[PDB]
Scaffold this motif. Structure first.
Motif, PDB file in Angstrom:
ATOM      1  N   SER A  68       0.798  -1.224   0.000  1.00 54.34           N
ATOM      2  CA  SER A  68       0.000   0.000   0.000  1.00 54.34           C
ATOM      3  C   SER A  68       0.832   1.277   0.000  1.00 54.34           C
ATOM      4  O   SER A  68       0.274   2.372  -0.121  1.00 54.34           O
ATOM      5  CB  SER A  68      -0.954   0.015   1.198  1.00 54.34           C
ATOM      6  OG  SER A  68      -0.267   0.387   2.380  1.00 54.34           O
ATOM      7  N   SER A  69       2.153   1.165   0.120  1.00 51.62           N
ATOM      8  CA  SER A  69       3.020   2.332   0.034  1.00 51.62           C
ATOM      9  C   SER A  69       4.431   1.863  -0.244  1.00 51.62           C
ATOM     10  O   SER A  69       4.814   0.775   0.196  1.00 51.62           O
ATOM     11  CB  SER A  69       2.990   3.164   1.324  1.00 51.62           C
ATOM     12  OG  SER A  69       3.115   2.351   2.471  1.00 51.62           O
ATOM     13  N   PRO A  70       5.219   2.638  -0.987  1.00 51.02           N
ATOM     14  CA  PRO A  70       6.655   2.349  -1.069  1.00 51.02           C
ATOM     15  C   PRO A  70       7.351   2.401   0.278  1.00 51.02           C
ATOM     16  O   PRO A  70       8.371   1.734   0.463  1.00 51.02           O
ATOM     17  CB  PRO A  70       7.186   3.431  -2.021  1.00 51.02           C
ATOM     18  CG  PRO A  70       6.035   4.306  -2.355  1.00 51.02           C
ATOM     19  CD  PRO A  70       4.783   3.622  -1.986  1.00 51.02           C
ATOM     20  N   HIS A  71       6.838   3.189   1.222  1.00 48.40           N
ATOM     21  CA  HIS A  71       7.450   3.259   2.543  1.00 48.40           C
ATOM     22  C   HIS A  71       7.248   1.967   3.324  1.00 48.40           C
ATOM     23  O   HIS A  71       8.152   1.519   4.033  1.00 48.40           O
ATOM     24  CB  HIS A  71       6.891   4.452   3.316  1.00 48.40           C
ATOM     25  CG  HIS A  71       7.555   4.682   4.636  1.00 48.40           C
ATOM     26  ND1 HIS A  71       8.916   4.856   4.764  1.00 48.40           N
ATOM     27  CD2 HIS A  71       7.046   4.767   5.886  1.00 48.40           C
ATOM     28  CE1 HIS A  71       9.217   5.032   6.037  1.00 48.40           C
ATOM     29  NE2 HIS A  71       8.100   4.985   6.739  1.00 48.40           N
ATOM     30  N   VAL A  74       9.611  -0.860   1.831  1.00 49.76           N
ATOM     31  CA  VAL A  74      10.997  -0.756   2.278  1.00 49.76           C
ATOM     32  C   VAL A  74      11.124  -1.155   3.741  1.00 49.76           C
ATOM     33  O   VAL A  74      12.074  -1.840   4.125  1.00 49.76           O
ATOM     34  CB  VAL A  74      11.546   0.660   2.025  1.00 49.76           C
ATOM     35  CG1 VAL A  74      12.999   0.746   2.436  1.00 49.76           C
ATOM     36  CG2 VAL A  74      11.414   1.027   0.573  1.00 49.76           C
TER      37      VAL A  74
ATOM     38  N   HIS C  71      15.132   7.052   2.438  1.00 46.73           N
ATOM     39  CA  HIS C  71      14.358   6.372   3.470  1.00 46.73           C
ATOM     40  C   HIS C  71      14.416   7.118   4.796  1.00 46.73           C
ATOM     41  O   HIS C  71      13.412   7.197   5.510  1.00 46.73           O
ATOM     42  CB  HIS C  71      14.855   4.936   3.635  1.00 46.73           C
ATOM     43  CG  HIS C  71      14.033   4.119   4.582  1.00 46.73           C
ATOM     44  ND1 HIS C  71      12.675   3.948   4.433  1.00 46.73           N
ATOM     45  CD2 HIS C  71      14.381   3.423   5.688  1.00 46.73           C
ATOM     46  CE1 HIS C  71      12.219   3.190   5.411  1.00 46.73           C
ATOM     47  NE2 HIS C  71      13.234   2.856   6.186  1.00 46.73           N
ATOM     48  N   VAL C  74      12.168  10.390   4.564  1.00 46.98           N
ATOM     49  CA  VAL C  74      10.741  10.129   4.723  1.00 46.98           C
ATOM     50  C   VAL C  74      10.413   9.773   6.166  1.00 46.98           C
ATOM     51  O   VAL C  74       9.400  10.219   6.708  1.00 46.98           O
ATOM     52  CB  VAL C  74      10.277   9.030   3.749  1.00 46.98           C
ATOM     53  CG1 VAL C  74       8.788   8.804   3.877  1.00 46.98           C
ATOM     54  CG2 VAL C  74      10.608   9.406   2.331  1.00 46.98           C
ATOM     55  N   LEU C  78       7.922  12.148   8.274  1.00 42.44           N
ATOM     56  CA  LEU C  78       6.692  11.586   8.818  1.00 42.44           C
ATOM     57  C   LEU C  78       6.626  11.760  10.328  1.00 42.44           C
ATOM     58  O   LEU C  78       5.565  12.080  10.874  1.00 42.44           O
ATOM     59  CB  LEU C  78       6.574  10.113   8.440  1.00 42.44           C
ATOM     60  CG  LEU C  78       5.840   9.804   7.137  1.00 42.44           C
ATOM     61  CD1 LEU C  78       5.810   8.316   6.896  1.00 42.44           C
ATOM     62  CD2 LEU C  78       4.436  10.371   7.160  1.00 42.44           C
ATOM     63  N   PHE C 223      -0.720   6.896   1.508  1.00 39.03           N
ATOM     64  CA  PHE C 223       0.139   7.326   0.412  1.00 39.03           C
ATOM     65  C   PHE C 223      -0.751   7.727  -0.759  1.00 39.03           C
ATOM     66  O   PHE C 223      -1.456   6.892  -1.325  1.00 39.03           O
ATOM     67  CB  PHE C 223       1.109   6.204   0.040  1.00 39.03           C
ATOM     68  CG  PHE C 223       1.927   6.479  -1.183  1.00 39.03           C
ATOM     69  CD1 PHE C 223       2.913   7.443  -1.171  1.00 39.03           C
ATOM     70  CD2 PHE C 223       1.722   5.754  -2.339  1.00 39.03           C
ATOM     71  CE1 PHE C 223       3.665   7.690  -2.291  1.00 39.03           C
ATOM     72  CE2 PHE C 223       2.475   5.999  -3.461  1.00 39.03           C
ATOM     73  CZ  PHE C 223       3.446   6.968  -3.435  1.00 39.03           C
ATOM     74  N   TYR C 234       1.969  12.074   1.181  1.00 40.49           N
ATOM     75  CA  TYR C 234       1.309  11.320   2.231  1.00 40.49           C
ATOM     76  C   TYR C 234       0.258  12.202   2.874  1.00 40.49           C
ATOM     77  O   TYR C 234       0.478  13.399   3.070  1.00 40.49           O
ATOM     78  CB  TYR C 234       2.312  10.830   3.279  1.00 40.49           C
ATOM     79  CG  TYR C 234       3.244   9.772   2.752  1.00 40.49           C
ATOM     80  CD1 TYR C 234       4.379  10.118   2.039  1.00 40.49           C
ATOM     81  CD2 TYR C 234       2.981   8.427   2.947  1.00 40.49           C
ATOM     82  CE1 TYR C 234       5.223   9.160   1.541  1.00 40.49           C
ATOM     83  CE2 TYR C 234       3.823   7.462   2.453  1.00 40.49           C
ATOM     84  CZ  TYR C 234       4.942   7.834   1.751  1.00 40.49           C
ATOM     85  OH  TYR C 234       5.788   6.873   1.255  1.00 40.49           O
TER      86      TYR C 234
END
Lengths: 265, 265, 265, 265
Positions: A68-71, A74, C71, C74, C78, C223, C234
């Motif tokens: 549901s997200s690239p975050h 990863v 990474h 983000v 967040l 996302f 986001y």
């Protein structure tokens, strides 16, 4: 509509009790020297240099319809990569040809089973070899079952202890800890008796502190740029070694048969 | 660059449980008198004079490329010398021809094994000889293994106790403590049952307080000048003796065979 | 070479004691009904519908030379976005024109200071209005200082209590909790006395469970696709409301002057 | 005959409560970067590089008739040198023109006494400036006495707390810690209110790990060869800095008079 999901499940995740049973010493430059008194004062040094357990992780700009997200992709892939790296570290601590427990044991500290199956007499002999404060037994779960069978045939029930959310069989108060990284070839495994600690001249694991992208002791995650296909890469590294301060801190029982059964009725 | 080092490792360092299990009485002039009622009131005195355990340590103005300073060399060599002196003290407490435990036991307090191997019956007989509050069993680790084997053949698992970071087999609630200073000759060792304490008429160790350069009870480090080669010398001394207040505080089991095995399968 | 870094530091992060002092009730469809007995049985319902606190976060494929990876950029952005959203939630809980504490208090539950400065008499009157188990006082830190000054002039030192890693002045055993979201206009602030709990007919906060990308109660991170410049976005959302079950669970002291001083010497 | 001696006594050894009240962060390369959000997200970095507190100790082959050995002379002189280095570290942490607490406070965080002597109102104002979890007050013992006098005149006895083997006056639950490194010039001292911690955006001390001859965090003892007169030298080093993560973690009360008394009878 919505479905409640889970983080991915890996079947090779083991409890890794050995990584918690060992004592860990930081090595600030990757070299550890053990000075041991030669005539038991002159000393002969033994050097331990940390070796790399590494893996390159390539995260894609792909679909992966579970994240549901690239975050989240990863995050989960880094978590799985770290679990795999720690499983490899446990395997290497048992099995490395240079600093593994099975390799660093001496011929004078290695004994054989009296009649194949692991009996209480064999574990008693192992205790005689490491009589100065043994910490735990290490073997395959099949070996634990074989020892339990031999104990039941002799009419002796061993007690259990609670540790790390697990129940451990103890012989003479020493836990018997299962590990699937202990090899079983031709139906034979090994039993390992270990004393851990630096202040009692035992066995210590080694790690390197102060690395780039540190998450766990000795564990480094670093971002190795971006390629043409926007596939980001991460390098995950673990520098590991094992040190035995005194030779009588480690003994191995060889030739342990795990497929012998007694008749009844 | 830099390498993480260790303090020197000595393989002869033992846990020395006997030095912690005994009760220690200070003797302010090196003489201890035990007045015992002759007809059990007239008394006959027995005298204990402390004997010297000593070693001369010569520290050199030499290279010793593991220390990085003359101060660290002296510190480590003093530490190793003190550990060796305490190991010698434990050996003497067990083995001295004058005040050792094996020598101070009487023929009426000494019994033999029924059939060679140390069985529960023999330990029961030993308990009958020291039935007034026995404190611990003392034997070689091989003897501990032999007793464990004989207990397993009889179907009796003895419990264990936790003490000084170790696990001890107990028989009738009395710990069985391993000591490598207990002799094993021709495959035979001894079992020693001991009650310790001065207020219960048991066994007490003796030390001299108020010495020059005192570090530990009875332990003296003194600097004996400088020679022509700038080789400084230190004298490390330990005045030690052992007292048995009543004869029934000590019993010895003789002729304990440690190489007998039972058949199975 | 390497420099040890920090995660970014935000000066607007407050301890947010109010978010921990309140009781939080989940609302499974965004609507909360409070049925209150009209003649104190007929009931008149009051409806609370959760309102959205939202922010859109655009993460760039830019340099940002403090992160070393996309990474880490983000992750930190967040984290900062979530901290800001929770600060906004606290502000709204105090200050919202519809469900804020200051707005939901009734004229019969609102009193004024006797002579401007917050004295022990005014706090006593506030306690008379919420005498059924008051939980905490809520005011600006300037108001806490003004109350402390008035207490010192009267010769009365109030004790303190330890809670959430903080020290709180208590009046009649009720903590006085500082909050910078409590307004100070023209040198005047407010004091708020609150009883919290659903099983004691007090004040409860409301949140929506089971959202997409849930991290904290009521907090959703989702996302929202990718634009042409590869700037990922986001959406962070927090649905919030506050319910007062009984009117006598909330009282407000108005006209509290925070800049009055006494003469001495 | 023999005389019982003491290790040398140094009158400048202070309890050094500030070295225990602070939180210490290791810096693996001597550089610390604090990233602070500029509009409270863009960030502006502030850099902290560790500075050296150093002293060269020359031990002689001289008589020094209080030591009885060259080994005891070096041990005691190293101990005294380390105590002096830590006293200097505390002084620098308070008083350094670059990273001292008094220097790193901003004009907006600095207030003056209303009428010279430190009264409860002034400490209340200080608390308003650091209202997010203040940890301790820091002042000279003369300032502690002056505050106690002003509190007694107002009829308010402040309680005390037990910490590090000491008794501390608390105002609003915050300890008032005495330090002789806080300057007193012209009869005026300062009061400092500090929040410590890295995970609460407070004040942290900085030290360098993994040095040659490390004994304490950041403390290095190294042997710098031998001269012609056999006078061995040791270099003792302490790399130190102090970081303020957020500006509202530190406030200073200026112009505190410590020689004002009230009339009675």
């Amino acid at each position: 509509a919505n479905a409640t999901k889970t983080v991915p499940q890996l079947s090779t995740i083991t409890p890794r009790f050995l990584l918690h049973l060992l004592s860990w010493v930081p090595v600030e430059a990757g070299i550890y020297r053990v000075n041991r008194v030669v005539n038991p004062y002159e000393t002969h040094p033994r050097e331990y240099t940390l070796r790399s357990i590494s893996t390159l992780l390539d995260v894609h700009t792909r679909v992966s319809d579970l994240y549901s997200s690239p975050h989240d992709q990863v995050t989960q892939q880094l978590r799985l990569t770290i679990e795999t790296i720690k499983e490899r570290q446990e395997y290497e601590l048992v099995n490395n040809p240079e600093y593994g427990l099975l390799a660093q044991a001496t011929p004078e500290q290695t004994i054989q089973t009296l009649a194949g199956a692991p009996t209480p007499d064999d574990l008693d002999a192992l205790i005689t070899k490491v009589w100065k404060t043994p910490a735990f037994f290490l073997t395959h779960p099949l070996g634990v079952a074989a020892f339990g069978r031999e104990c039941t045939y002799r009419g002796v029930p061993p007690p259990t202890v609670s540790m790390y959310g697990a129940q451990f069989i103890t012989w003479r108060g020493i836990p018997i800890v299962p590990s699937d990284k202990v090899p079983v070839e031709d139906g034979t495994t090994k039993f390992v008796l270990v004393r851990t600690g630096e202040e009692r001249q035992g066995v210590v694991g080694l790690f390197q502190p102060g690395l780039v992208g540190e998450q766990a002791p000795g564990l480094s995650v670093r971002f190795t740029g971006i390629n043409r296909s926007a596939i980001a890469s991460y390098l995950v590294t673990l520098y590991t070694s094992l040190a035995v301060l005194t030779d009588d801190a480690l003994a191995v029982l060889d030739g342990v048969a795990v497929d012998q059964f007694h008749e009844y009725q």
